[PDB]
Design a binder for this molecule. Structure first.
Ligand SMILES: CCCCCCCCCCCCCCCCCC(=O)OC[C@H](COP(=O)([O-])OCC(O)COP(=O)([O-])OC[C@@H](COC(=O)CCCCCCCCCCCCCCCCC)OC(=O)CCCCCCCCCCCCCCCCC)OC(=O)CCCCCCCCCCCCCCCCC
Ligand SMILES: CCCCCCCCCCCCCCCCCC(=O)OC[C@H](COP(=O)([O-])OCC(O)COP(=O)([O-])OC[C@@H](COC(=O)CCCCCCCCCCCCCCCCC)OC(=O)CCCCCCCCCCCCCCCCC)OC(=O)CCCCCCCCCCCCCCCCC
Ligand SMILES: CCCCCCCCCCCCCCCCCC(=O)OC[C@H](COP(=O)([O-])OCC(O)COP(=O)([O-])OC[C@@H](COC(=O)CCCCCCCCCCCCCCCCC)OC(=O)CCCCCCCCCCCCCCCCC)OC(=O)CCCCCCCCCCCCCCCCC
Ligand SMILES: CCCCCCCCCCCCCCCCC[C@@H](O)O[C@H](CO[C@H](O)CCCCCCCCCCCCCCC)COP(=O)(O)OCC[N+](C)(C)C
Ligand SMILES: CCCCCCCCCCCCCCCCC[C@@H](O)O[C@H](CO[C@H](O)CCCCCCCCCCCCCCC)COP(=O)(O)OCC[N+](C)(C)C
Ligand SMILES: CCCCCCCCCCCCCCCCC[C@@H](O)O[C@H](CO[C@H](O)CCCCCCCCCCCCCCC)COP(=O)(O)OCC[N+](C)(C)C
Ligand SMILES: CCCCCCCCCCCCCCCCC[C@@H](O)O[C@H](CO[C@H](O)CCCCCCCCCCCCCCC)COP(=O)(O)OCC[N+](C)(C)C
Ligand SMILES: CCCCCCCC/C=C\CCCCCCCC(=O)OC[C@H](COP(=O)(O)OCCN)OC(=O)CCCCCCC/C=C\CCCCCCCC
Ligand SMILES: CCCCCCCC/C=C\CCCCCCCC(=O)O[C@H](COC(=O)CCCCCCC/C=C/CCCCCCCC)COP(=O)(O)OCCN
Lengths: 140, 459, 347, 53, 56, 121, 107, 70, 54
């Protein structure tokens, strides 16, 4: 729900890193839990224990991604003293991509993931700054 | 403008109601007459434009491209007459229909007072070219080539459409005259940066830009001769024409946003000219030479100075003619040797002296020998770049040197030396091929007498 | 079956759709849906085989679950306001129940799983009926209550449908599954403009129905249900393959073909509402549909595949039965772009 | 979509059953009939947006 | 021979006819853009005694 | 612009009475000519599918194709023109009835408007 | 392994046919000598004779719609006027400053 | 001779451009006004457009209802 | 000619797109045809939809 969205967004971007990391970790974990539920539904692998293991691995991976993104992005914003900069978000995305690569132990996916995640993060920051609407209300 | 559009449309029923052995003659004669009629668009004004109606308008940037488009069809028919001999009447009529439809779409694209109409026709040109490449190409790679030539284009062109409609939702119009008269500066914003990118990338991919040029060697190598001619001569210039039209709304953001594309073009011209030095295929070498010339045109358009625009127009026309001639020469060799490997058939001067003269003159125009219009455009762009920054001279001179090197390498490898002994099927050159070569080359040396016809609207 | 019984069942399906379209009472709309479902099953099981029975039972399970969800939405809406008229819902929960029921009836993602399997199981004429006529009633109901829908949910399902159709069509050799994934993508395109303009929804529906009718009638004429079977058609009916290639190009959204009209217009409409990112993603994803349409065109008409010796006998015979509206469908699906402003007719 | 055949023909196929205060048999009165009548008379012809606000 | 080569050369006449039709249509479209004829500040001209329109 | 609920709209009329106050399209309308061309194309494709001489197989059938397409196109053009006329009429009436939402801009000449100049160097 | 190694029934690849073989003076247009000769004649007449020569002469004698001599004469009389009156040739202002209203800063 | 037999004077193209520009500018301002009018009508609902149906009041029965209090 | 033009420029834009679309298509279209999994996903999506929006 939007409760986690508000919990993340309410914290100022350039301050108070640990709560930002906590919120991003929770959001990532919720996303991973939804992904695990869908994966269990569509592909029941063999049994209960392997299924709960797969849920654990997906949730921990997504939570680690969110934690690293939030921590790195907030630390970059704090040290650079320049809030409202998409570069900080891009760095966070790159950090998140690196963490994902480590989990999958692939140099290519880690590199590929880092570049793509960073770009996505930069775009989200630009949308926050400029007021871009993903889901626009009917205006006209 | 209908006095040119209607005859081009009438080319279709005339082609489909023709005798089985009169299609080439009738198509060639009436396409030549259409070219002659279109030649009267060259009487341009020093003032605004030739505004025929609400839908079509002519400009001294559009008129040379229109005349070259009309002139290219008879040459394409003459080049296609040979390798389509063993094919049924219905399929040859379909091939001529594809060529006529391509000409019609290009003609309507170059006038196209509306930006959405320009986009629609500029994307409608895609279908005939794809069918020609993937139907009448020889090798098995043609399908793959077609896919590239498709998706690259759309990958650039789909964002543009969005940008276009967005502009009309804010400005209220997409008419080029209203856009030019009511133009306003673009503020340095992320939204404006992405609008700039959406406006530019579609035309950048079809120049092509150096990083985005992968589709061109495949598409030009696997296409039949008419397809290669139309791809190199007219279809590459759509990006330049679109950029020249659309950069009027992108100021002053072009000053900052031009840097990555300027660096890409200035380094990629060197890269592609160097690639030409090590090439085992004639068509691939000619394609990479086209990439280098269009990189120079991209630099010219990005600098956006009067001399830049004049040089870019002149270079677009000259490159179209020269590349079409070079592809025709390569195809004349190929239809004899069936290999398309440059090192295989050697010493063709001793067996085909007049064709060797044609090769020499084509290499000379590709080499940008003065006072050809190739060098006129080259020098205007180079001077504009020098005014932009004095350090561009190193890259420009290096490109000139490498261009001369690979042009003369291509000439020496194929024409000089000793003939290959085991090749004994090199027949004397036909009157059709010599006529095709002359009809390519005389317009160039005759345009060098009246350069203002191809120097664009800023002359 | 008996032609009388077949005609009766077809008119009962059409009368159910009509009942849904002309009524103002929620009970009568539900009754029309029930009538349509009841008369649709034997049409899917007209030719008896285990696959058709499986397709019919899957279709029945899906549609009956959707009908029960729709009646639940109706009763909740009645509970929170004693109204039976189809208009704005007045209840947030009821609207969601209604939206999911109609998404399940239409086949929108994530309720898309039944469409490819049902289309593959049934014959080509049944598939034509299922993919053309069975979208009118749910879309009409959606248009009637478009002011109620949460844009977030509808747009999420639309984008999901476009993505799923594009990705799922890439992996198919069967023509019916390709048509099913194409229909899923086109439904995704249709439902993304409901929150903003129902006229664009209807225009997209009409264009899609025209193209789907042309493509199915071409597939029935050249009786092929696989890629390799269709690859033999050039050796008997090359003109059919040429028409099919042009229709496939139109279905991929290339200008100046008719298939470019909806997306363009839809994109244009979505730009008037300050929605930029979503149309961009929709077009980029439609490139996938274009890719597998182009692969089909490569395999069918742009290259000549090997044939067999028995094909010679087929050279001596001509079709006994013909579709009267096939040429009109082809022309309307390829060459109506110049007549775009006629969309003001509120089609 | 909605083809209002009843309004064009004056049929009244299902409008008798849509609201509480519409001519019940034996003049039986709905529990919320007074409230519904007032709401309907307030919102008649005004349009959905203005009726809601 | 007349009535014989016509059946073999009828197609040739079509392109020329199209050119004439396009010229006629261009003039007809010109006739719909006369809202400012002899009204521009640059070419406000007083009509000749035996003149109807400055340009056609 | 959703006009489904527009007041005084008879449900299933293709053309209302007030549409008769608009000029009917000319028979030489380019859109009508395109409709006839579409009918001719349909006739040719019908000939081709049936393996008949495409240009000269059925002249009665091709004539019927052209005529039906022209007929429907004429009525469709009438309805389209009527709907666009209604859109313009409603727009103008709304602007007239709400002057406070469309205030007049003060006409200002370029002589006293300061536009920032950006050199091209 | 009784397989034929013949993967399918295929026509052999035909050898290319020389137009000079059945017809010297072949012009490379068609294998029919009459159609070949007339194709050569129409290409040469409508390409070299009509378009290339007459079109080039037409372009050479195009009227001055660009107004090069007009601008030269205007500049000539304008320079004659300003030199006679001692005016400083070209002015640095493109528009008259009296008719421009600058915004007062009051900084 | 060429100018006399193939072309026209500058007045024709000049005034045609004037007319074309005038038409296109009117179309642009009409489009902008139309967008603003649509926004206002959809926001307030007091116009002819975006009129959503409400219950018809002719369906109400105004009669004694077996109970004085309705 | 080789490192950039034939390898890395191919690897970046076209080959990456082809690989990603290939993998996504494989993941999307690989369902065994068991309606148990389908309706389990239906319950999941329905449950998620009600909670997130309201
Ligand atoms: C259009 C304009 C012009 C464009 C021009 C073209 C531009 C594009 C082309 C050039 C692209 C260069 C980078 C491409 C990606 C390279 C990595 C990759 O592809 O992985 C596949 C591949 C997948 O893993 P794998 O094949 O399973 O592993 C087998 C390896 O042999 C096992 O390797 P190993 O274990 O021997 O390696 C040990 C060590 C490597 O360290 C070293 O030896 C050198 C240390 C310095 O590992 C690392 O350092 C990882 C960090 O990884 C590798 O094989 C190579 C790994 C080393 C990569 C080093 C970093 C490369 C340069 C990265 C910087 C440039 C891009 C950064 C962008 C970040 C922000 C956007
Ligand atoms: C220099 C003054 C000339 C005055 C005389 C008028 C000449 C008119 C020529 C017009 C263009 C020629 C047409 C091109 C195709 C050639 C036809 C052919 O196959 O020949 C058969 C014919 C019969 O020979 P064959 O035995 O049957 O054939 C045996 C083999 O073919 C073996 O044959 P081959 O081994 O004898 O080779 C054929 C020959 C012919 O093939 C070619 O290569 C000719 C094309 C070379 C130009 C390459 C493009 C570069 C851009 C230059 C643009 C200049 C055009 C100016 C306007 C032209 C108007 C159309 O190639 C050469 O000999 C190499 C010459 C290299 C010249 C490079 C210098 C260029 C700049 C010179 C100054 C231009 C501006 C001056 C400004 C200041 C003064 C006012 O041979 C000839 O008649 C030779 C052609 C004349 C030689 C041209 C050399 C200079 C002419 C330059 C263009 C006009 C200059 C205007 C200024 C007047 C004052
Ligand atoms: C921009 C707008 C302006 C231009 C409009 C463009 C469209 C206009 C026409 C639209 C459709 C109408 C015709 C379609 C029916 C098909 C007919 C046909 O098959 O051709 C055979 C037929 C001749 O053959 P036949 O001896 O009678 O019978 C043998 C079989 O029919 C055939 O023998 P077969 O079956 O044994 O041969 C097999 C062959 C046969 O298969 C085919 O050729 C089928 C034809 C393609 C289907 C077209 C789809 C629907 C049209 C949409 C076009 C989209 C355009 C948008 C741009 C994208 C381009 C794709 O199939 C193949 O070879 C397959 C491989 C081919 C490569 C891939 C196919 C590429 C398709 C793209 C074609 C697009 C242009 C087509 C032009 C018209 C073609 C006739 O052609 C014709 O004669 C009809 C041409 C039109 C007649 C014009 C009459 C007017 C002249 C006198 C009045 C003058 C008017 C001016 C008034 C003022 C005078 C004073
Ligand atoms: C074989 C050996 C040689 C034998 C032959 C010897 C004779 C050689 C002489 C010819 C070449 C020598 C050069 C001398 C040039 C003399 C003619 C020249 O001066 O006239 C030019 C005139 O020619 C034209 O300017 C150039 C021709 C235009 C070319 C159009 C191309 C034809 C259409 C083909 C299709 C288009 C394909 C390409 C698309 C872009 C320039 O004149 P200009 O001072 O300026 O004004 C003309 C006269 N005015 C003053 C009344 C106005
Ligand atoms: C591959 C073959 C060729 C394809 C085409 C290549 C051409 C595309 C290049 C795009 C042009 C430039 C894009 C952005 C230019 C903005 C200027 C920026 O570079 O400078 C700094 C921008 O700072 C940082 O760049 C912030 C963004 C950081 C995130 C970007 C990702 C970095 C690498 C991504 C490259 C990948 C390109 C391909 C994507 C698929 C200045 O910071 P600041 O003065 O404060 O803000 C200026 C912008 N304002 C004024 C609107 C606010
Ligand atoms: C791709 C081509 C599709 C063509 C469609 C099929 C053509 C054959 C149809 C045969 C004739 C149809 C006319 C029907 C007669 C009476 C019409 C009347 O009953 O309906 C009116 C309206 O009729 C239709 O709206 C007009 C249909 C015309 C469709 C053409 C527009 C398609 C877009 C342009 C593409 C080019 C097509 C032209 C070439 C043939 C009033 O409708 P209304 O009860 O008040 O509200 C319902 C609609 N709402 C809900 C959206 C408001
Ligand atoms: C030295 C003297 C000759 C100089 C060279 C002149 C040669 C000119 C050739 C090139 C012409 C270019 C195009 C000019 C025509 C443009 C189209 C149109 O505008 O022209 C129309 C006239 O065009 C002619 O009727 C047709 C010209 C066709 C030329 C064909 C030449 C080649 C034919 C070869 C046939 C050979 C016989 C067959 C052998 C097999 C009249 O225009 P119009 O709409 O009024 O203009 C409005 C303004 N007005 C009213 C003041 C005029
Ligand atoms: C998010 C979704 C975005 C959707 C973008 C779609 C871009 C269009 C390309 C999609 C390709 C999908 C098909 C695919 O990759 O399958 C692999 C396929 C396997 O071959 P088949 O034809 O299927 O089988 C024949 C032999 N048995 O490989 C190929 O053939 C690839 C050939 C075509 C390559 C074309 C590449 C074009 C892309 C250029 C760069 C731009 C990409 C578009 C996005 C731009 C970035 C925003
Ligand atoms: C050869 C393959 C190349 C593929 C395409 C490359 C071009 C990419 C350009 C961007 C694509 C979409 C841009 C949107 C089109 C213009 C519309 C516009 O300018 O509106 C902007 C909207 O701006 C955006 O929404 C941009 C979002 C972009 C999302 C998609 C990102 C695609 C990849 C991004 C990284 C790469 C960017 C450059 C790539 C160049 C090609 C290699 C502002 O409008 P509002 O938001 O309503 O007003 C501001 C107040 N609210």
């Amino acid at each position: 729900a939007k409760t986690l969205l508000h919990k993340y967004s309410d914290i100022p971007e350039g301050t108070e890193c640990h709560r930002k990391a906590y919120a991003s970790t929770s959001i990532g974990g919720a996303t991973g839990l939804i992904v695990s539920a869908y994966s269990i539904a569509l592909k029941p692998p063999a049994s209960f224990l392997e299924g709960v293991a797969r849920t654990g691995r997906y949730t921990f991976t997504s939570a680690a991604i969110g934690a690293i993104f939030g921590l790195t992005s907030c630390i970059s914003a704090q040290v650079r003293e320049k809030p409202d900069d998409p570069l900080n978000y891009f760095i966070g995305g790159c950090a998140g991509g690196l963490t994902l690569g480590a989990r999958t132990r692939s140099y290519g996916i880690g590199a590929a993931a880092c570049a793509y995640m960073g770009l996505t993060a930069a775009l989200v920051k630009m949308g926050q700054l400029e007021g871009w609407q993903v889901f626009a209300e009917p205006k006209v | 403008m209908l006095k040119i559009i209607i005859p081009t449309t009438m080319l279709l029923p005339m082609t489909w109601m023709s005798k089985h052995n009169m299609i080439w003659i009738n198509a060639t004669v009436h396409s030549l007459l259409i070219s002659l009629i279109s030649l009267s668009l060259l009487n341009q004004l020093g003032e605004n434009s030739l505004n025929f109606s609400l839908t079509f308008f002519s400009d001294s940037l559009s008129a040379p491209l229109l005349v070259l488009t009309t002139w290219l069809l008879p040459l394409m028919l003459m080049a296609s007459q040979s390798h389509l001999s063993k094919e049924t009447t219905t399929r040859k009529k379909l091939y001529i229909t594809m060529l006529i439809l391509l000409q019609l779409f290009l003609i309507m694209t170059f006038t196209a007072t509306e930006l959405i109409l320009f986009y629609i026709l500029f994307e409608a040109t895609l279908v005939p070219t794809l069918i020609i490449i993937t139907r009448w190409g020889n090798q098995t790679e043609r399908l793959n080539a077609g896919l590239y030539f498709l998706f690259y284009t759309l990958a650039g062109s789909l964002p543009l459409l969005v940008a276009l409609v967005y502009i009309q939702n804010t400005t209220g119009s997409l008419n080029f005259l209203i856009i030019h008269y009511w133009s306003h500066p673009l503020s340095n914003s992320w939204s404006n940066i992405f609008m700039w990118l959406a406006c530019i990338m579609a035309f950048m991919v079809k120049m092509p830009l150096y990083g985005l040029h992968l589709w061109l060697p495949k598409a030009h190598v696997e296409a039949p001769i008419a397809g290669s001619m139309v791809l190199a001569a007219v279809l590459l210039k759509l990006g330049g024409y679109g950029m020249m039209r659309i950069t009027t709304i992108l100021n002053p953001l072009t000053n900052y946003m031009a840097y990555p594309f300027l660096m890409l073009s200035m380094w990629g011209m060197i890269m592609t000219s160097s690639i030409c030095l090590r090439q085992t295929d004639l068509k691939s070498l000619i394609a990479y030479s086209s990439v280098s010339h269009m990189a120079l045109v991209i630099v010219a358009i990005m600098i956006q100075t009067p001399w830049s625009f004049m040089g870019a127009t002149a270079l677009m026309i000259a490159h179209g003619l020269t590349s079409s001639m070079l592809f025709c020469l390569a195809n004349t060799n190929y239809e004899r040797v069936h290999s398309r490997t440059m090192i295989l058939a050697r010493g063709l001067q001793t067996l085909l002296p007049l064709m060797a003269t044609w090769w020499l003159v084509a290499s000379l125009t590709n080499l940008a020998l003065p006072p050809s219009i190739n060098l006129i455009g080259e020098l205007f762009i180079i001077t504009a770049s020098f005014s932009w920054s004095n350090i561009t001279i190193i890259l420009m001179g290096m490109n000139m040197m490498i261009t001369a090197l690979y042009s003369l390498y291509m000439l020496i490898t194929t024409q000089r030396g000793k003939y290959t002994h085991h090749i004994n099927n090199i027949k004397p050159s036909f009157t059709r091929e010599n006529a095709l070569m002359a009809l390519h080359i005389l317009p160039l040396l005759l345009l060098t007498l009246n350069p203002k016809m191809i120097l664009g609207p800023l002359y | 079956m008996n032609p009388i019984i077949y005609t009766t069942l077809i008119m009962t399906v059409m009368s159910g759709t009509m009942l849904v379209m002309i009524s103002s009472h929620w009970l009568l709309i539900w009754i029309g849906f029930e009538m349509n479902l009841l008369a649709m099953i034997p049409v899917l099981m007209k030719n008896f085989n285990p696959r058709a029975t499986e397709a019919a039972t899957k279709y029945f399970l899906t549609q009956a679950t959707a009908s029960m969800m729709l009646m639940m939405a109706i009763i909740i809406n009645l509970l929170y306001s004693g109204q039976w008229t189809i208009t704005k819902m007045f209840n947030p929960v009821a609207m969601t129940m209604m939206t999911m029921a109609l998404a399940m009836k239409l086949g929108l993602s994530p309720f898309h799983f039944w469409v490819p399997e049902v289309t593959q199981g049934i014959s080509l004429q049944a598939g034509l009926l299922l993919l053309t006529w069975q979208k009118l009633a749910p879309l009409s109901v959606l248009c009637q209550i478009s002011q109620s829908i949460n844009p977030n949910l509808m747009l999420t399902m639309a984008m999901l449908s476009i993505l799923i159709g594009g990705w799922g069509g890439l992996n198919q050799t069967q023509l019916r599954k390709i048509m099913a994934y194409s229909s899923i993508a086109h439904m995704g395109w249709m439902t993304a403009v409901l929150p903003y303009n129902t006229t664009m929804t209807i225009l997209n529906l009409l264009i899609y129905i025209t193209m789907t009718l042309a493509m199915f009638m071409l597939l029935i004429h050249s009786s092929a249900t696989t890629t390799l079977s269709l690859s033999h058609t050039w050796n008997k009916m090359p003109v059919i393959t040429s028409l099919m290639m042009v229709t496939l190009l139109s279905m991929g959204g290339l200008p100046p073909l008719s298939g470019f009209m909806p997306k363009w217009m839809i994109i244009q409409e979505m730009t008037k509402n300050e929605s930029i990112i979503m149309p961009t993603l929709m077009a980029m994803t439609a490139l996938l549909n274009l890719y597998f349409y182009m692969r089909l065109a490569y395999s069918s008409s742009l290259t000549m595949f090997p044939s067999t010796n028995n094909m010679k006998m087929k050279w001596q015979f001509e079709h006994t039965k013909q579709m009267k509206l096939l040429p009109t469908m082809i022309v309307l699906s390829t060459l109506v772009l110049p007549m775009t402003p006629a969309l003001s007719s509120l089609n | 979509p909605f083809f209002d055949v009843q309004k064009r023909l004056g049929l009244d196929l299902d409008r008798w059953m849509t609201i509480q205060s519409a001519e019940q048999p034996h003049k039986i009165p709905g529990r919320c009939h007074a409230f519904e009548k007032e709401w309907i008379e307030c919102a008649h012809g005004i349009g959905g947006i203005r009726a809601e606000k | 021979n007349v009535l014989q080569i016509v059946r073999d050369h009828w197609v040739h006449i079509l392109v020329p006819v199209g050119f004439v039709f396009g010229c006629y249509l261009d003039r007809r479209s010109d006739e719909k853009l006369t809202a400012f004829r002899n009204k521009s500040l640059l070419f406000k001209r007083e009509l000749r005694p035996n003149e109807e329109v400055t340009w056609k | 612009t959703m006009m489904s609920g527009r007041p005084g709209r008879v449900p299933l009329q293709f053309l209302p009475n007030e549409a008769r106050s608009l000029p009917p399209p000319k028979l030489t309308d380019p859109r009508l000519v395109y409709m006839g061309f579409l009918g001719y194309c349909s006739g040719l494709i019908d000939n081709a599918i049936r393996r008949r001489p495409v240009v000269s197989a059925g002249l009665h059938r091709q004539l019927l194709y052209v005529t039906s397409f022209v007929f429907f196109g004429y009525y469709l053009l009438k309805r389209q023109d009527y709907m666009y006329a209604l859109r313009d009429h409603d727009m103008f009436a709304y602007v007239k009835s709400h002057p406070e939402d469309f205030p007049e801009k003060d006409k200002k000449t370029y002589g006293e408007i300061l536009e920032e100049f950006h050199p091209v160097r | 392994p009784p397989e034929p190694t013949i993967r399918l029934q295929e026509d052999p690849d035909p050898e290319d046919e020389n137009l000079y073989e059945k017809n010297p003076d072949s012009h490379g247009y068609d294998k029919d000598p009459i159609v070949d000769l007339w194709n050569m004649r129409v290409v040469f007449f409508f390409g070299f004779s009509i378009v290339l020569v007459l079109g080039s002469t037409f372009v050479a004698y195009l009227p001055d719609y660009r107004m090069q001599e007009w601008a030269r004469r205007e500049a000539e009389r304008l320079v004659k006027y300003r030199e006679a009156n001692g005016l400083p040739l070209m002015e640095s202002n493109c528009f008259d400053p009296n008719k421009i209203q600058l915004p007062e800063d009051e900084d | 001779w060429i100018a006399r037999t193939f072309y026209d004077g500058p007045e024709k193209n000049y005034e045609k451009t004037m007319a074309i520009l005038q038409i296109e500018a009117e179309k642009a301002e009409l489009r902008l006004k139309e967008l603003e009018v649509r926004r206002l009508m959809r926001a307030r609902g007091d116009g002819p457009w975006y009129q959503y149906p409400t219950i018809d009041k002719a369906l109400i029965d105004h009669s004694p209802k077996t109970t004085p209090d309705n | 000619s080789s490192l950039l033009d034939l390898i890395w420029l191919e690897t970046i834009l076209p080959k990456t797109t082809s690989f990603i679309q290939m993998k996504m298509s494989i993941m999307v279209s690989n369902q065994k045809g068991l309606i148990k999994l389908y309706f389990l996903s239906f319950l999941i999506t329905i449950m998620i939809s009600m909670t997130l929006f309201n």
